[PDB]
Amino acid sequence: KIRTKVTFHRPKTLKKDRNPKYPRISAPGRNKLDQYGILKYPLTTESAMKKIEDNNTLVFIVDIKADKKKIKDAVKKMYDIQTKKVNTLIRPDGTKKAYVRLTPDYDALDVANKIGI
Amino acid sequence: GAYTYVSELWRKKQSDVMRFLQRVRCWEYRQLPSIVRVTRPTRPDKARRLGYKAKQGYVVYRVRVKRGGRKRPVPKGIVYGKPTNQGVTQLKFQRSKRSVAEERAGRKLGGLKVLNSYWINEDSTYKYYEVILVDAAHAAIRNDPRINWICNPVHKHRELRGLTSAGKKYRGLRGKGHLYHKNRPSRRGTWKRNQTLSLRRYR
Amino acid sequence: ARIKVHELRNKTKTELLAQLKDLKAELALLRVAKVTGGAPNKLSKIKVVRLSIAQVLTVISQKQKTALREAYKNKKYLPLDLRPKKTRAIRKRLTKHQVSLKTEREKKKEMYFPIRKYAIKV
Amino acid sequence: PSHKTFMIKKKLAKKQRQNRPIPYWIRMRTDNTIRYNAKRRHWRRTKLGF
Amino acid sequence: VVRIQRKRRILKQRLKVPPSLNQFSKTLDKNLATNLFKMLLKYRPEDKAAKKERLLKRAQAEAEGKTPETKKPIIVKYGLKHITYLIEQNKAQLVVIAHDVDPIELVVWLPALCRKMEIPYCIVKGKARLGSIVHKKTASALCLTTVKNEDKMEF
RNA sequence: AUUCCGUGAACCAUCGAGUCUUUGAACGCAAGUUGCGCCCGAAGCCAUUAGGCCGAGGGCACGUCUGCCUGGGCGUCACGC
RNA sequence: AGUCGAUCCUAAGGGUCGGGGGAACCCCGACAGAUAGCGCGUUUCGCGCGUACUCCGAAAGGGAAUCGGGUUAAAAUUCCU
RNA sequence: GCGACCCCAGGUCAGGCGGGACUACCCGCUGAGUUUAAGCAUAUCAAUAAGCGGAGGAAAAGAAACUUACAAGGAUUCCCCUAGUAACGGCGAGCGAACCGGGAACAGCCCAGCCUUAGAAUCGGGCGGCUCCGCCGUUCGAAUUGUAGUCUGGAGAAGCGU
Ligand SMILES: [K+]
Ligand SMILES: [K+]
Ligand SMILES: [K+]
Ligand SMILES: [K+]
Ligand SMILES: [K+]
Ligand SMILES: [K+]
Ligand SMILES: [K+]
Ligand SMILES: [K+]
Ligand SMILES: [Mg+2]
Ligand SMILES: [Mg+2]
Ligand SMILES: [Mg+2]
Ligand SMILES: [Mg+2]
Ligand SMILES: [Mg+2]
Ligand SMILES: [Mg+2]
Ligand SMILES: [Mg+2]
Ligand SMILES: [Mg+2]
């Protein structure tokens, strides 16, 4: 054997991927954050109604754990409407609120009428 | 028929052969960490007589401990008290060095049970013991009737409760009679029993 | 119109999932009614729908767990969630056979000189 | 301050929710002993001490 | 590990070795060792497969052949206990001791015992080689108690 | 709500089935941060012995025991060159 | 709020592996040591480099990117154009 | 260059174990002073409080390297007595057991070493079966630097009879 480096380096040895005999968890967990759990209920305040009328935007109360991507996906699944952009904030009461602006192809007033506000 | 030969040779500790071997071994141990597993015992006969068996689940760890007394660990060697307690040096730990070694092994290896230990080597600075430990979770141990008692919960941390051979030695349980009666069932238990003031219903 | 657990137990997984989806949609509609100022009759249905959702979920979970237990029956190395819980110390305990293990001399002593049945009268 | 951590904000939200009078119908319950909310807090009287 | 195993050899070389340990540095010559070991290769103990085959043959033939007599096997003996017992009982005819037994207190007295019992002994290189002889990872020592008629002269 | 002569009310009792959020000995790294990483992967989109997007969900701490795989050192030897 | 900040970097320092002490709670802190890994081509294996912490530590230090105009009872370089 | 062994290294390798929590009792360590002595330093407070660890339903102890000096008792533990005694103590203040005797309960045992060598008879894992806290078959591995079996001083090995 010929060594050109004075420093000794640990040789590379094979590693094996885990192949457990039994699964630690019997079955995959349930999807807690589904679309129904993501979308709690729409907001029916005066400001929300003004947003719907003017900016073609819906106002929703959403699970605090939900992100903008999940909110967009849940809105699409629930109401079959595209979203131009989702803005989010956490109210002082601790709940998450989302302003979801629909694309021009969709009418916020018609969507709200279908929802039932 | 060889263990007797080995035992007598190890009894002859001042012989040239033993001195050479112990010198080499002490040098080698000085270069390694304080606690280190050994593949097999270096005193097979002593391990046998202390309860080691050459089967799966038995392990041996070499433990190195510092020599000397116990200096009172007070800052600047200052004692706030009476002259009788003002002493700092020349104070002695109530436990033995082998007990310290077993405690270190047991604390380090929380998943095993310390069965026993024995002296192997020493220099002016260090004393060396080998501790025999048992993996109570192994099927061989659990199915061996002579040792599976160690798996019962009452034997947890024997070394830390002083239940090993060294534990009994330093607790004063290796003798019986007028010279040792105060240590049974324990020194503190005897003190409590003796100090108890019994006030019966009918006095 | 009320949900019966014994009736749910006779349904399949797909039917139970469809019923769960319908109940979730109804619960969402009831929440919308509540936030828009629904009448007390609509408001009272929230408890019923939530109970129905919980019942359906429980039936699904019990069926799945029974299936998993049957699949893992007569097998070693079960999943931890399916292994018996008991307590930590009880789980660590030695088995009855291991407790009863003894040496050959002890077995011979028990076989040769057991405690005899005797009386003192004559 | 305007800069606040998420955990502190959530704790403040909980405190705000807890700071309210008791429902009126609580006083009409059979064998009721609650007269008012004994744990009411005012931002100027007692500080949260966070 | 490398540094310490090299320094151990250096220290053993530097320090004076008492004669009892020094006697283990003089092993059997190459030619003599090769002859002895080629002799030993034909007295190896049966392996697990051979033992199982012989046991099943004996079980099959027990009732049918009415337990026919079988010649006593002639094989090398191993295991420190058994070797020491044979030496003490004067049944051993040749003793072979590995030169690299660790701890060496196990066999440091064996040459003295063999000399006292008038049993010829040799110190050879390789407990691993002895173990290979006896189908084991290592063997502290081996012993021959008897040899075959065709091999008595060379023995 | 309840065939209230009944698979049946209950802010009833009891327990075997099941669910059980963020943490905490707390375990990928941290923390006055819902901050910063890596790995596997159901279903779906078009993509066809080819790979892409997404992601349900789950993994990656330390010390140890048994067994195993992959390796290092003339540390002890042997066979060849 | 992709554009304002945290988030990223490191400062004084803090917290650590191994090692050394310690009855032990713990103490020193990369100092007693087979480091993390990083590039090239690929039958995913080979080749070449590889000085023992790729951790915390700044809403005033360093630093990727937004501007008008308009709009609310209360928000905006975040909402509308 | 190959092979055997030794020691060690890396594995999110297959399967296991450990950490922490509670306080009345229990086990180990460490450890004061207030106070008493009409002052005070040895002593006392106290082998205590505080501090650091480790268990269970009890823990610990336990089958004599004992007590005794007798016409002898016979593991350990606890109660009564011994006894405020022997002893210790600026022999000051104070401190202070044990044996016998009477009761509660009672239980004895397992190893190491010389002793298969006509073959490790021992044990663990995987796989396949079964009346599945275990048994059987097969295959790998551990182990001769010793797993099983016999033996533990009260004995015991070997031999001969019942
Ligand atoms: K004093
Ligand atoms: K950070
Ligand atoms: K240490
Ligand atoms: K360090
Ligand atoms: K900054
Ligand atoms: K603008
Ligand atoms: K087997
Ligand atoms: K034995
Ligand atoms: Mg290096
Ligand atoms: Mg003091
Ligand atoms: Mg360390
Ligand atoms: Mg960084
Ligand atoms: Mg006990
Ligand atoms: Mg009296
Ligand atoms: Mg008595
Ligand atoms: Mg098996």
UniProtKB/Swiss-Prot annotation, chain A:
Q: Does the keyword Heme apply?
A: no
Keywords attached to this entry: Ribonucleoprotein, Ribosomal protein, RNA-binding, rRNA-binding
Alphabetically, the GO molecular function entries are:
mRNA binding; rRNA binding; structural constituent of ribosome
Please cite one Gene Ontology biological process associated with this protein: translation
| GO CC annotation, single | cytosolic large ribosomal subunit
The UniProt record lists the keyword Flavoprotein: no
In terms of superkingdom, the source organism counts as: Eukaryota
Q: Which protein family is named in the record? A: Belongs to the universal ribosomal protein uL23 family.
Q: What does this protein do?
A: This protein binds to a specific region on the 26S rRNA.
Record-given protein name: Large ribosomal subunit protein uL23
**Highest lineage ranks of the organism?**
Eukaryota, Viridiplantae, Streptophyta, Embryophyta, Tracheophyta
Q: Which gene encodes it?
A: RPL23A
Q: Which residues of the full protein are shown?
A: 37 to 153 of 154
